[PDB]
Design brief:
2 copies of one chain form a homodimer.
Chain A: E1 3-4, H1 7-17, H2 27-38, E2 46-50, H3 56-61, E3 67-72, H4 75-87, E4 89-95, E5 101-107, E6 120-124, E7 137-143, H5 152-156, E8 163-173, E9 191-192, E10 198-199, H6 201-209, E11 213-226, E12 231-244
Parallel strand pairs in A: 1-4, 2-3, 2-7, 3-6, 7-8
Antiparallel strand pairs in A: 4-5, 8-12, 9-10, 11-12
Bound molecules: S-adenosyl-L-homocysteine (SAH) (2 copies) and 5-sulfanyl-L-histidine.
């Protein structure tokens, strides 16, 4: 009897574990791979995948880190990651034409990360109010999270407390700020300030983070999300890499 | 207001899609469709063509390079105004979206495109594909790209359109079949649904059931297109073209 995910969870199962579309590398694999590259001078004892959704990037980080915590606001996402981790498979509904669907099974043993999955622990939790035990990380990776937060500065201005000195914070975002998710006054960029000048999100990130971090690198990373049998979202996130001073 | 296609944001989105730069190696969709349509209709007289759901008018201008007269019809007055402004004033401006609320101003210059040799052969009209006025008839080609999945009742259009096409003329549809209740009540979707007997209905099959009364299906092909939303976010979609010859 395979655990079956709902429609919201199915979308992220498809995104994180489905076959690559339009020749684009799997996003979680691309992000975890780069993070491992950028943190090559760290001991790689502890990583945090914050906003881990159905957990693919946590599994991928665990191939290099001794221990990886994956945390997500959504209990349903965490349940799906945990079921794949413990029982080895989960089922989901891939979007098709109209209301039509294609049922798919994700088999843990079909991925290279099968050699490391016991090094991950998944938790429900909130990036803006993490419990104190989530600390002493060599790496905190938060991919496509900041423009889903109502007040992203609440996460960003405190996160240095959970990272070891010379450890890394790695963010990605396509900077698609929207009032449905984030109050305009809390957008990190993508707005015209009171003086008429355009504020870029990377500039806003520097202003928040350069108190405790140095900006080491930026890189563009595409991803593709399936909406129907024929319609897809093709987006380019910017990765920014920050080293604790 | 209520119609998303009447908003300035949709006008700017379709200006960029129809007249702007290619993305991800995907060629301009209006030109691809018009070029393929001219190929499929090579043996017809090429006197009159209708571009139904023409949005900001690019495919109408491109059809007019080969047809003696082209009518572009859209339900959105804002789209019709934009196409007419480009046609008559020779330029229109629009906004590209960046991060968040940021925008960049761009200009479309009529004289920068090859279709500039034919733009007086187009007439643009506001109109309803599901209930066209009688004067829109006697077409050698009717091309309706990405239209059917935005119609309130697609059968009003599909069951009647053969009456507006000359004998041996063509109807050429494209659609990605993005059926949504915001555009079309589910009872009127041509496909993408499970019927009352539990069978899955594909849109192309639903199209065959309706159109094979008066048409022969001549060809299908897949055509990708890309719509920029922001400088970092895009729709990337595979439309299905179907080519129908009136019997
Ligand atoms: N306050 C919060 N704390 C933690 N996770 C949150 C959160 N608000 C949203 N999330 C989660 O963050 C994710 C945003 S979507 C990005 C998911 C994944 N990291 C990827 O890059 O594809 C979702 O899984 C969402 O449930
Ligand atoms: N009943 C109707 N009659 C005419 N046009 C309609 C319509 N319902 C929707 N439309 C138009 O159909 C278009 C859908 S998007 C497709 C636009 C263009 N043909 C392209 O291929 O890119 C919009 O321009 C919309 O205004
Ligand atoms: N998403 C675009 C393109 C489109 N047209 C028809 N279907 C689809 S998707 C729109 O809604 O106009």
């Amino acid at each position: 009897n395979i655990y079956e995910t709902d429609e919201s969870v199915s979308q992220y199962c498809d995104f994180q574990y489905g076959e690559d579309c339009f020749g684009v590398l799997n996003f979680a694999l691309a992000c975890a791979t780069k993070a491992i590259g950028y943190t090559k001078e760290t001991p790689k004892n502890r990583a945090l995948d914050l906003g881990c959704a159905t957990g693919r990037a946590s599994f991928e980080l665990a191939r290099s880190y001794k221990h990886v915590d994956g945390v997500d606001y959504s209990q349903a996402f965490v349940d799906a990651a945990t079921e794949l981790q413990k029982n080895g498979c989960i089922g989901y509904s891939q979007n098709g034409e109209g209301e039509l669907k294609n049922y798919k099974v994700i088999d843990r043993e079909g991925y290279a990360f099968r050699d490391s999955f016991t090094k991950v622990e998944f938790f429900q939790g909130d990036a803006c109010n993490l419990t104190p035990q989530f600390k002493e990380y060599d790496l905190i990776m938060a991919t496509n999270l900041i423009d889903r937060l109502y007040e992203p500065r609440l996460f960003l201005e405190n996160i240095h407390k959970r990272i070891n000195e010379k450890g890394y914070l790695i963010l990605t975002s396509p900077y698609t700020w929207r009032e449905e998710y984030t109050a305009k006054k809390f957008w990190i960029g993508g707005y015209v300030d009171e003086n008429g000048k355009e504020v870029s999100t990377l500039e806003g990130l520097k202003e928040i983070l350069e108190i405790h971090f140095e900006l080491v690198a930026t890189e563009d990373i595409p991803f593709v999300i399936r909406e129907t049998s024929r319609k897809f979202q093709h987006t380019i996130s910017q990765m920014s890499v920050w080293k604790v001073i």
